[PDB]
């Protein structure tokens, strides 16, 4: 089922800035008109987030360079899709991802999210093969070009698919004390440039008691067979720009502001800069003229 779509020279930086994102509800308790300070894993404000494209259409006639490397987990990942043709269909997690330990698999098909924290190997380029079914864009079915085994399979889960203008999606992955929680948020953005000049909350969706070890992860991409070449050398596919982001979470304290409706309107980091830190120690989003003392929060 697997192929070898790997022949290129990687561009190491491939990153941009994330202005104000990654804030998610840390608990299941409703609050309103109150500012709460929550010490938890979070993405930094104005952080550096990877900007992998994975589809570099450039040149006189263009090309379909493929790039979905494996990324370290580092005790938390923030992910976004901002797709237009619904071509990102889940993720892969594990320690070494080759018949050693349990590995988590996520696939988002039409009406079934497939979860498999089970022991099986992943090739160097796991992906998904999808076709439009006569261009009707209704059946839109996929393929298992992701793995080749299901040995010693432990956990499974199925429910309504996570996937339902640019359609900016945001996900937060956190493997803490044996509980894997996937938070999510759907937001449309008109601008086709990088992340918007705005803020939005990020709700939880489902918690998984996988209880495994995760150190590296990879993204799954749905690809369409543009042409079938005779003597198949893993012919190039087409999905379109495969534009996804990656963020890294760290343990810090944020101040979360709730409105009357209970939705988060804005948040301020306690380590971004002294001004934002001064807001935390005062537990207020407005700081009057004067001089204030602040407590250390660095690692």
């Amino acid at each position, epitope marked *: *089922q697997c192929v070898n779509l790997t022949t290129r020279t990687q561009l190491p930086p491939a990153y941009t800035n994330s202005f104000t994102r990654g804030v998610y509800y840390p608990d299941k308790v409703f609050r309103s008109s109150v500012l709460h300070s929550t010490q938890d894993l979070f993405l930094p404000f104005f952080s550096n987030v990877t900007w992998f494209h994975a589809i570099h259409v450039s040149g006189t006639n263009g090309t379909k360079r493929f790039d979905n490397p494996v990324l370290p987990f580092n005790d938390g990942v923030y992910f976004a899709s901002t797709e237009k043709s619904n071509i990102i269909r889940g993720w892969i997690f594990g320690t070494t991802l080759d018949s050693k330990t349990q590995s988590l698999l996520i696939v988002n098909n039409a009406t079934n999210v497939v979860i498999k924290v089970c022991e099986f190997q992943f090739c160097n380029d796991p992906f998904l093969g999808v*076709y439009y079914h*006569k261009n009707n864009k209704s059946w839109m079915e996929s393929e298992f070009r992701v793995y080749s085994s299901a040995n010693n399979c432990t956990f499974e889960y199925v429910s309504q698919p996570f996937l339902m203008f640019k359609n900016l999606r945001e996900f937060v992955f956190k493997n803490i004390d044996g509980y894997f929680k996937i938070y999510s948020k759907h937001t449309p953005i008109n601008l086709v440039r990088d992340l918007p000049q705005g803020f939005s909350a990020l709700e939880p969706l489902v918690d998984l008691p996988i209880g495994i070890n995760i150190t590296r992860f990879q993204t799954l991409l749905a690809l369409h067979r543009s042409y079938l070449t005779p003597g*198949d050398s893993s012919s190039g596919w087409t999905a379109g720009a495969a534009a996804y982001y990656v963020g890294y979470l760290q343990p810090r304290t944020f101040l979360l502001k709730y409105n009357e409706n209970g939705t988060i309107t804005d948040a301020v980091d306690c380590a971004l800069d002294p001004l934002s830190e001064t807001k935390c120690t005062l537990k207020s989003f407005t700081v009057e003229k004067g001089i204030y003392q602040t407590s250390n929060f660095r690692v």
Partner: antibody, heavy 125, light 105 residues
Framework: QVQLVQSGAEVKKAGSSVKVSCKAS????????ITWVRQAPGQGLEWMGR????????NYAQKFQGRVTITADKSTSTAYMELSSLRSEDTAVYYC??????????????????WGQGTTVTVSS | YELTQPPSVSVSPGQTASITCSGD??????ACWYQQKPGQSPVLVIY???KRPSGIPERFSGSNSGNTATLTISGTQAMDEADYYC?????????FGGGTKLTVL
């Protein structure tokens, strides 16, 4: 890429067990459902069934109910079948083709991308 | 589920040929058409709805109507001699029709 090269024409007596197979020699044996269609002179095409190697689920046709025993093993990377109770009228040319998918409801997503050269069978009586 | 088509069709070269593959509830069933030449194995020219796989010249086209499937031929040549079989994957099974033989003067 699958060539689906198979054996040439064979001569055998009537009422004997018939064994025919196609060997790929090209792409991976799995990841490509293998189906067979019978070609006869002035009778159109006849579909009997298909087998998915990796899934191992085989579907039969209405007229070929119980007269075929389809098996496929990944270790041998070859698909072979046992045919019996064959009459002279049933004699025809058998073909084998791939379908690019290995799932039951997904064979609708493709046509028969590659065919075989055709292995004619003659019945002697 | 049952396929019946004319035994044969004849048309002058360079003309537009229309072939009808009638049946029972074949519209909204996503029929597919195949091609077979004398002395050569069958090849895929129309896949999943009048769709032409890569490597095939832009000569075969058509549309699927409410209860009929039609194939239009453009730029007919001498080497177009072949037999067309229209089939569909119905009820987890494939049904093959009698087929039509194209004749060119």
């Amino acid at each position: 890429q699958v060539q689906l090269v198979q054996s040439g024409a064979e001569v055998k007596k009537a009422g004997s067990s018939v064994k025919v197979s196609c060997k790929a020699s090209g792409g991976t044996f799995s990841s490509h459902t293998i189906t067979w269609v019978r070609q006869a002179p002035g009778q159109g095409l006849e579909w009997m069934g298909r087998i998915i190697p990796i899934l191992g689920i085989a579907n039969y046709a209405q007229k070929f109910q119980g007269r075929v025993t389809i098996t496929a093993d990944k270790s041998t990377s070859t698909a072979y079948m046992e045919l019996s109770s064959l009459r002279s009228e049933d004699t025809a040319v058998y073909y084998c083709a791939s379908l690019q998918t290995v799932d039951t409801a997904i064979e609708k997503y493709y046509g028969m991308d590659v065919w075989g050269q055709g292995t004619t069978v003659t019945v002697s009586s | 589920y049952e396929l019946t088509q004319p035994p044969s069709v004849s048309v002058s070269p360079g003309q537009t040929a229309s072939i009808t593959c009638s049946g029972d509830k074949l519209g909204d069933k996503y029929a597919c058409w195949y091609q077979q030449k004398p002395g050569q194995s069958p090849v895929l020219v129309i896949y999943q709805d009048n769709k032409r796989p890569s490597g095939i010249p832009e000569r075969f086209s058509g549309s699927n109507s409410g209860n009929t499937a039609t194939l239009t031929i453009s730029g007919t040549q001498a080497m177009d001699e072949a037999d067309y079989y229209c089939q569909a994957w119905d009820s987890s099974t494939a049904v093959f029709g009698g087929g039509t033989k194209l004749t060119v003067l």
